[PDB]
Symmetry: C2
Subunit: 122 residues, 2 copies
């Protein structure tokens, strides 16, 4: 069993049911529960990321992956400034629209801010 | 008569003959003589420009016109920096090659540096 909500013991399957795919509602209606130090908790602590097949928090290989949840599931990038808002992101939860008409040293600037994105869900 | 070379009196026609169209040789072999304060002199003093039909130096309406003689008779403008080298020019003696691939606020920057050019001899 695992320690839950600082008062009861629950099994893996319970923690797993909570975790599973609260489809949309990221903003107060999901968390996606994880296992860490025999506790079933809302999210991995700092320095940890979630090993997917077993809900288990494991320490990060270098800096932790960073999931960026977009407002309304979308974001339009039309400048270096808007691209910067995604700096450090490795996972985009949503969809991206690229609308860049001008500027300077864009390939390097865009690579600095968007070069770490590994996945886009939309 | 006019005062010439600080020792003799010469007539208008003499000053005019000196002035006339020493075709090329701008760099030590021309000057184009002018009239100022009853002197026939190599060039207009600061604040004056030459009224063309009578060789007479007249005070400048605002800043004075500026002749820019190009090295080898040409110049390639490929940046804001190279354009700046022509800032203030009203006459180009030579030919211009424009090769601008990128940058920012170019229309304003180029107009600031090249917007006063009235004539190109090549």
């Amino acid at each position: 069993y695992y320690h839950f909500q600082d008062w009861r013991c629950v099994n893996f399957s319970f923690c797993q049911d909570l975790h599973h795919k609260c489809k949309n509602s990221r903003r107060q209606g999901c968390h996606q529960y994880v296992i860490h130090n025999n506790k079933c908790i809302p999210e991995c602590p700092s320095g940890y990321t979630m090993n997917s097949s077993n809900l288990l928090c494991t320490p990060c290989l270098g800096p932790c992956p960073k999931v960026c949840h977009l407002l309304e599931g979308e974001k339009t990038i039309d400048s270096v400034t808007s691209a910067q808002e995604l700096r450090g992101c490795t996972v985009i939860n949503g969809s991206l629209i690229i609308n860049i008409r001008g500027g300077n040293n864009l390939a390097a600037e865009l690579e600095a801010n968007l070069g770490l994105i590994e996945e886009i869900s939309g």
